[PDB]
DNA sequence: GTGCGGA
DNA sequence: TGCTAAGCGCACCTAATTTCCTGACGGCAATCCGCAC
């Protein structure tokens, strides 16, 4: 009989993503031609329009406010944006880097094998390939585009392309042949029948000629300068890997109140999405209580809770007992 | 029963750890030697007997995550923290600790000793390196895995070597003053971390990662290093890092 | 004085009782240390650390905490609640000296000033002059644990950071010209959570910079030299029968495309993609022939020497008489 | 049931404007001929004519004053300035970047739907197209011009031209057919009946031969001279300066009957030109949005025009606790 | 679910 | 498809002085704390 989670248990990511690099193109010559995209320096003159106490308002309502910033825009002769990144898929059971107790290892390996037996990592993989098909990794670069085109290459086989403006960001499709064929290979990589899979993703966004591209913004703490700082990857603009992965993990539609709020949330340990300030899974349908009901008090759970637990184990983290002194 | 040299050529590592409590820069040498040992341990579970006994570290390009100000100084950047286990795990904003990350392109020269060292060993290393990390960073791509014979089959780059003589023969009154003076005289040297030193005795405590091994509390030790090109080098053996263990000291040295 | 001070740090008499009463209930919860654990993650349960008072070597090859010249020890608690002693032994008195130096000699300068403000200076001084040492007793998930090979087997090692060494690198680099980096990530409230005096005083430390030399730093120039150009014409529907240029007027099109793309991009050899035989094999497949139709040659419409991809797209098969035309024009 | 504004509220722009690039042409051959315009480096010798204290003036009144500058002029063979920029129009209900309370989102969406139910974003859009029609984005390049012509292109249709010296800068026209035709599409883009709209604007300014052109100047922060804006090697203008000249549409402030001119739309109504704040206590954005959403009161239509104009402009509107 | 305690 | 083999490319001397290098206003709001009660 096992009574508490082990003193040291850790997991690693099974979906590893690389940083993205941005380019500019032309749409009718998008398979032959590419130019670099660079970040520029912009300084502005503003007015004080923040909410101030009434004493300070009488003294500071009409005062100048210079600030420093940075910007990124396309040229006057190019109308498209090209984004290239890559994903590495690794097996789940070989991603346990630490486990102090041996019986917990045996029990969790038995539970993952029973999950391979029934729904062998196919539904979750279908949702992850969908979140590549609708292009949610474009966050503010998806607003105001005429054509969005996404191409997925596995090994040396280029798959047929996607029109990413024909998918809704609230429904998951389970009847497209290309999505099913990628999802089967990702399921086989997750289940142990393969050992590694490398995916390459290229996206083309047509926004207009001299329009604004929105790169990722860095979190830096300096006291002399306080301005907007954007990501520069090898001299050119880019997006972080964490941004692209949050977009990919937005697959959760099994939280306790989904009939009121009807959007999918990211997969987290307490359902803490950064958009809404109240957690969605705070006590009874959290990860710790469901894994203490699955393993420690042997009991069959509904399939949605198993989907959530396995998605947390694909995400990774430090899952251990409350540390005592 | 045989000895050779295998070269892992031009590997891209993204987001590797770059903080060792007094140093922000190149990762510690123990991470690279542990990458070599992890490759050895994964190859020996596929029933392929091999033993890596020395690694040479060659540098081609680097990029520290951050920016350079107008005064010429670096300002580091860190990712936004997420949920961290503890007493404030259900909150929306988490704490910000001390961290730094670096991007590297490097090449590795491995001295292998086994019963067979052909190109099937190279194929196995190619099949076993897409499931490992270097420091805490991911491998995006490599160029080619091949056997070498002499110094002229090595690509161009700059190797890292130990310079402990330039630290023991300088200034005085403490070791840190020798470090600062030796860094002020010749400008092409860097401080590096080279292993660990004990702070307690060996035993068993509660809370270990593996509860069936020996345990010791340690502190990191630091030394000096320098860069030499690959076309001004004498011998292969003068750029290979190895393990050495005294009683209370866990180090990495060039003999 | 230690007078006004113990008031600034909050009637005007119940006060001086609150500070001194709050002080004695906490002088048994402050210990001495050279290495602390919550400097890595401030969520490590307990008071785990170490006091390394050993001997220097001075000619060993390595820097440690015992070979440097740390001058001031550190005092550490577990919870900020209990942290008055570190402020108390930090208030400077009249002679520009620290409560610490006066409590080791007992100059009456203090002897006099305390006894009017309290009734228990005797008990307080004994608890700041014989302080217990920090002991390493257990490990947790927040302290970094790694393996190290020792002689056919492995040892598990838990790393504890050094607080006294961090304070002395920052002082000795504020007056120096070797490269350095300042880290500004720790806040005031989180520094107090660590529990150490030397981290709440230096929360934004100065550290060494250890980088490779500066001609090996990434930029846009050393990133456009690892990419290769492809032509803007698809031969598959373009004046050409099965790969061979039938129209002599379409030669100038090849000349102008090669002139346009890869014009001012010279690349030395080390910076050129190899010329694998598989691509001229793969080009022929599309059109058969099993063999080069002698009298014709594969020409990369964009010179693999002025920047071009070793790809099926960047070639077109033209006659030798046509080939002598193109190799001279692009050379010129 | 709603007390306070949420702790993280922000909006995004619904009128994204590109930067401007400047060219030089001739007026009779302006449909077949354009040349680049560049910024030149100037240095000037001066006299010390700034106001000084009496002691320093006796010692530094006949001293030379070297200074550095920059300038931009047309050539001897060209007489016309050509400026090109573009506008992207996005919907208003899908421009909400952050909100930490779902009920406030539902309330804001209901009030915007009520706004589309009374007036389908048509008055504001007519004012925005009016500020394109009178060429208010030419700030100092509009003084001293013979002919100003502005052409508006949407998709592959070039709308008929505008004479920008017949529109007054203090009145808004509602009877011009071309303005109405563009404004209906901008209003339908604001409503949500279309997902985006891209408008490209070209303007020709006849000023004469070798006369001066005034670009935008760059901000300096430490201890400086005159630096002018360069966009792809040529002279040009900032996007913020054009966008400020397209938001001078507010004629609903409390003291409009005394000063009869439109002001740009801001939160406290601050006119940098005429040195008076015009919306300081009760008709600011904060009090009106706290009297619209948090107490369910039916405001007059002019205040609704101001609130929707601020929500097309954008900003950070967050409360502490 | 609170309030403490420093630099 | 071939287009040369050999040698060498100065010794002197210098590179100016004066006067000065602007006055204004301002440089964001949010958050990033464990622990004992």
Largest separation between any pair of C-alpha atoms in chain A: 72
Query: For chain B, which chains pass the contact test of at least 3 CB pairs under 8 Å?
Result: A, C
Closest CB from A47, A146, A211 relative to D266: A47
B 190-209 residues with CB < 8 A to A = 206-209
Q: How far is the CA of D238 from the C1' of F20 (A)?
A: 35
- CB of D228 within 8 A of CB of D70? yes
Which residue is listed with tokens 């150490």? C196
Listed as ranges, the nucleotides of chain F within 7 A of a protein C-beta are 19-23, 25-36
Tokens found for residue B203:
């035993």
Query: For chain A, which chains pass the contact test of at least 3 CB pairs under 8 Å?
Result: B, C, D
Chain B residue with minimum CA distance to C177 = B184
Cβ-proximal residues to A299 (8 Å cutoff; 6+ apart), any chain? A293
Closest CB from A62, A209, A276 relative to D270: A62
Q: How far is the CA of A65 from the C1' of F25 (A)?
A: 9
Q: Is D299 left (phi over 0), alpha (psi -120 to 50) or beta?
A: beta
Nucleotide nearest to D220 (CA to C1'): F27
In 3D space, the residue among D21, D94, D46, D145 whose CA is nearest the CA of residue D314 turns out to be: D94
Indicate the resolution in Å.
Answer: 2.5
DSSP string for C170-237: HHTTTT--S-EEE-----HHHHHHH-BHHHHH-SS-EEEEE---GGGB--STTTSSS-----S--TTT
Residue of A41, A44, A71, A210 best to disrupt the D interface, most CBs of D under 10 A? A210
- CB of B174 within 8 A of CB of C67? yes
Closest CB from C150, C184, C210 relative to B245: C150
A45 chain-D contacts, CB cut-off 8 A = 219
Can you tell me whether residue C21 is helix, strand or coil? Answer: helix
Per the structure, the residue whose CA is closest to nucleotide F23 at C1' is: D50
User: How many residues can be counted in chain D?
Assistant: 321
Listed as ranges, the nucleotides of chain E within 7 A of a protein C-beta are 3-7
Q: Any chain A CB within 8 A of the CB of D86?
A: yes
Which residues fall inside 7 Å of strand E, measured at CB?
C 9, 22, 80-81, 83-84, 86-87, 90, 188-189, 191-193, 200-201
| Chain centre distance of CA D227 | 22
Nucleotide nearest to C202 (CA to C1'): E7
Q: How far is the CA of C298 from the C1' of F3 (A)?
A: 29
Closest CB from B76, B221, B250 relative to C63: B221
Q: Is the dihedral of CA B93, B99, B104, B107 positive or negative?
A: negative
Q: Any chain B CB within 8 A of the CB of A98?
A: yes
Which residue is listed with tokens 């998930």? C141
**B141 Cα to chain A: minimum distance (Å):** 10
Method: cryo-EM
Nucleotide nearest to C80 (CA to C1'): E5
In 3D space, the residue among D282, D206, D203 whose CA is nearest the CA of residue D245 turns out to be: D203
Residue of A4, A101, A196 best to disrupt the B interface, most CBs of B under 10 A? A196
Per the structure, the residue whose CA is closest to nucleotide F18 at C1' is: D64
Nucleotide nearest to C200 (CA to C1'): E7
Per the structure, the residue whose CA is closest to nucleotide F25 at C1' is: A64
CA distance B126 to B141: 11
CA distance C103 to C129: 8
**C234 Cα to chain B: minimum distance (Å):** 30
Q: Mapped to the 3 state alphabet, what secondary structure does chain D carry?
A: CCCCCCCCEEECCCEEECCEEEEEECCCCCCCCCEECCCEEEEEEEECCCCCCHHHHHHCCCCEEEEEEEECECCCCCCEEEEEEEEEECCCCCCEEEECCHHHHHHHHHHHHHHHHHCCCHHHHHHHHHHHHCCCCCCCCCCCCCCEEEEEEECCEECCCEECCCCCCCCCCCCCHHHHHHHHHHHHHHHCCCCCEEEEEEEEEECCCCCECCCCECCCCCCCCCCECEECCEEEECHHHHHHHHCCCECCCCCCCCCCCCECCCCCCECCCCCCECCCCCCCHHHHHHHHCCCCCCCCHHHHHHHHHHHHHCCECCCCC
Tokens found for residue B63:
């990029």
Q: Is the dihedral of CA A288, A291, A297, A300 positive or negative?
A: positive
CA distance A173 to A163: 14
The HSE-up count of residue B10 (CA atoms within 13 Å, CB side) is: 9
């Amino acid at each position: 009989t096992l009574k508490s989670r082990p003193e040291n248990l850790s997991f690693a990511r099974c979906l590893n993503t690389t940083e993205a690099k941005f380019w500019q193109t032309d749409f009718l010559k998008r398979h032959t031609f590419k130019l670099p995209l660079l970040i520029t320096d912009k300084a502005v003159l503003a007015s004080k329009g923040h909410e101030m106490p009434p004493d300070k308002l009488e003294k500071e309502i009409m005062d100048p406010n210079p600030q420093k910033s940075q910007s990124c825009t396309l040229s006057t002769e190019c109308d498209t944006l090209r984004i290239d990144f890559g994903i590495k898929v690794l097996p789940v059971k070989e991603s346990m880097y630490s486990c102090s107790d041996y019986n917990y290892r045996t029990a969790i390996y038995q539970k993952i094998d029973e999950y391979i037996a029934e729904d062998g990592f196919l539904t979750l993989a279908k949702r992850y390939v969908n979140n590549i098909a609708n292009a949610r990794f474009l966050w503010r670069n998806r607003k105001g585009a005429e054509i969005i085109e996404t191409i997925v290459t596995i090994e040396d086989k280029e798959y047929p392309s996607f029109n990413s403006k024909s998918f809704n960001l609230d429904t998951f499709v389970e009847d497209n042949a290309t999505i099913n064929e990628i999802a089967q290979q990702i399921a086989d990589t997750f289940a142990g029948k393969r050992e590694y899979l490398n995916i390459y993703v290229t996206c083309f966004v047509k926004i207009g000629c001299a329009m604004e591209v929105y790169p990722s913004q860095e979190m830096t703490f300096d006291d002399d300068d306080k301005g907007k700082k954007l990501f520069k990857f090898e001299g050119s603009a880019g997006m972080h890997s964490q941004k692209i992965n949050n977009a990919l993990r937005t697959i959760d539609t099994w939280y306790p109140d989904y009939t009121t709020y009807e959007f999918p949330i990211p997969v987290e340990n307490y359902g803490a999405a950064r958009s809404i300030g109240i957690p969605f899974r705070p006590d009874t349908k959290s990860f710790y209580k469901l894994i203490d009901r699955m393993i420690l008090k042997n009991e069959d759970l509904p399939i949605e809770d198993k989907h959530y637990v396995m998605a947390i184990l694909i995400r990774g983290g430090m899952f251990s007992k409350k540390q005592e002194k | 029963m045989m000895k050779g040299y295998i070269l892992l050529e031009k590997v891209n590592i993204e987001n590797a750890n770059a903080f060792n409590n007094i140093i922000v820069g190149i990762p510690a040498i123990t991470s690279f030697l542990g990458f070599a040992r992890a490759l050895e341990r994964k190859l020996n579970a596929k029933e392929i007997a091999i033993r890596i006994n020395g690694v040479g570290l060659e540098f081609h390009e680097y990029e520290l995550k951050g920016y350079k100000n107008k005064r010429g100084q670096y300002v580091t950047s860190c990712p936004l923290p997420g949920s961290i286990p503890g007493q404030n795990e259900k909150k929306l904003d988490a704490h910000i600790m001390n961290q730094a990350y670096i991007d590297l392109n490097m090449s590795f020269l491995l001295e292998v000793e086994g019963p067979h060292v052909d190109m099937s060993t190279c194929k196995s290393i190619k099949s076993t390196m897409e499931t490992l990390r270097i420091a805490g960073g991911i491998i995006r791509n490599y160029k080619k895995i091949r056997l070498i014979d002499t110094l002229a089959d090595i690509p161009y780059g700059y190797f890292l070597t130990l310079r402990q003589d330039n630290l023991n023969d300088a200034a005085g009154d403490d070791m840190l003053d020798k470090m600062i003076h030796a860094l002020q005289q010749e400008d092409t040297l860097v401080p590096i971390a080279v292993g660990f030193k004990a702070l307690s005795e060996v035993g068993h405590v509660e809370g270990q990662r593996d509860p069936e091994k020996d345990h010791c509390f340690v502190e990191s030790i630091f030394s000096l290093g320098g860069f030499e090109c690959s076309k001004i080098l004498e011998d292969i053996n003068s750029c290979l890092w190895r393990y050495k263990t005294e009683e209370g000291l866990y180090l990495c040295t060039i003999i | 004085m230690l007078r006004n001070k113990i008031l600034a740090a909050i009637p005007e008499e119940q006060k001086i009782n609150k500070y001194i009463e709050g002080l004695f209930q906490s002088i048994d919860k402050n210990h001495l240390a050279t290495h602390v654990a919550k400097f890595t993650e401030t969520n490590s349960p307990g008071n785990i650390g170490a006091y390394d008072i050993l001997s220097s070597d001075m000619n060993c090859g390595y820097l440690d905490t015992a070979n440097a010249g740390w001058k001031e020890p550190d005092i550490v608690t577990n919870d900020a609640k209990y942290k008055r002693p570190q402020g108390f032994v930090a208030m400077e008195m009249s002679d520009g000296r620290t409560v610490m130096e006066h409590l080791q000699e007992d100059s009456a300068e203090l002897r006099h000033e305390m006894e009017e403000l309290t009734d228990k200076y005797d008990e307080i001084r004994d608890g700041i002059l014989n302080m217990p040492s920090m002991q390493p007793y257990r490990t947790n998930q927040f302290i970094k644990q790694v393996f190290f090979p020792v002689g056919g087997s492995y040892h598990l090692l838990s790393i504890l950071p050094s607080t006294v060494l961090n304070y002395e690198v920052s002082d000795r680099l504020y007056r120096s010209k070797i490269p350095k980096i300042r880290l500004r990530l720790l806040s005031s409230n989180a520094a107090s959570t660590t529990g150490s005096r030397l981290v709440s005083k230096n929360k934004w430390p100065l550290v060494f910079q250890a980088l490779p030399p500066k001609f090996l730093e990434k930029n846009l120039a050393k990133a456009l030299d690892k990419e290769y150009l492809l032509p803007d014409i698809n031969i598959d529907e373009l004046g050409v029968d099965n790969g061979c240029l039938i129209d002599e007027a379409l030669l100038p099109l090849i000349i102008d495309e090669g002139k346009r793309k890869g014009e001012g991009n010279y690349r030395p050899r080390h910076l050129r993609d190899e010329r694998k035989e598989e691509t001229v094999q793969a080009f022929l497949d599309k059109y058969g022939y099993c063999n080069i139709p002698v009298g014709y040659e594969v020409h990369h419409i964009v010179p693999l020497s002025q920047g071009g991809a070793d790809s099926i797209k960047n070639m077109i098969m033209l006659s030798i008489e046509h080939h002598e035309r193109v190799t001279e024009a692009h050379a010129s």
